[PDB]
């Protein structure tokens, strides 16, 4: 099940939920999130795991540059965890208003 993934693996799926990204690009996003370096020896072995699980698709582009993207299963895993997270956070009216402001501010910033 996708609910048993590690936090690092779930964060990869989150990064790819925004848009498909080259391996090097995923590293940058994760490094910005964690605020610390992400070693090559950790990212790509986990990317391969997500590909084997059917959650991520690997597209080998021209020359040694790979683009990773969420599969339909991967996207469902991202939505599933978001729905559960929101089911626990939206516990009253103030919580709802907080999430709606976040969503609205993010969308306007697009």
By the criterion CB under 8 A, which residues form the site for a copy of itself?
A: 1, 3-7, 10, 14-15, 17-19, 33-35, 78-79, 81-93, 95-96, 98-100, 102-104, 106-107, 110
Question: For residue 25, what are its two tokens?
Answer: 């690009």
> Is 46:58 a contact under the CB 8 Å cutoff?
no
In the complex, the smallest distance separating the C-beta of residue 86 from a copy of itself, rounded to whole angstroms, is: 5
> Is 43:30 a contact under the CB 8 Å cutoff?
yes
Question: For residue 10, what are its two tokens?
Answer: 């779930």
Among 98, 102, 103, 104, which residue interacts with Br ion (rule: CB under 5 A)?
A: 98
Residue closer to a copy of itself, measured from CB, 7 or 61: 7
Residue 2 binding partner per list Br ion, a copy of itself, none, with a CB distance cut-off of 5 to 8 Å that depends on partner kind: Br ion
Residue 33 binding partner per list a copy of itself, Br ion, none, with a CB distance cut-off of 5 to 8 Å that depends on partner kind: a copy of itself
Residue 61 binding partner per list Br ion, a copy of itself, none, with a CB distance cut-off of 5 to 8 Å that depends on partner kind: none
> Is 68:26 a contact under the CB 8 Å cutoff?
yes
- CA 74 to chain CA centroid, nearest Å: 9
Question: For residue 27, what are its two tokens?
Answer: 């590293």
């Amino acid at each position: 099940d996708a609910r048993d993934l590690t936090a690092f693996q779930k964060n990869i799926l989150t990064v790819l939920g925004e848009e498909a990204r080259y391996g090097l690009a995923i590293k940058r996003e994760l490094e910005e999130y964690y605020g610390e370096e992400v070693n090559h020896g950790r990212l790509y072995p986990n990317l391969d795991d997500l590909v084997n699980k059917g959650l991520v698709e690997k597209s080998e582009l021209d020359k040694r540059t790979n683009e990773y993207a969420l599969t339909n299963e991967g996207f469902d895993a991202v939505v599933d965890d978001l729905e559960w997270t929101l089911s626990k956070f939206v516990a009253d009216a103030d919580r709802r208003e907080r999430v709606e402001t976040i969503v609205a501010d993010d969308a306007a910033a697009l």
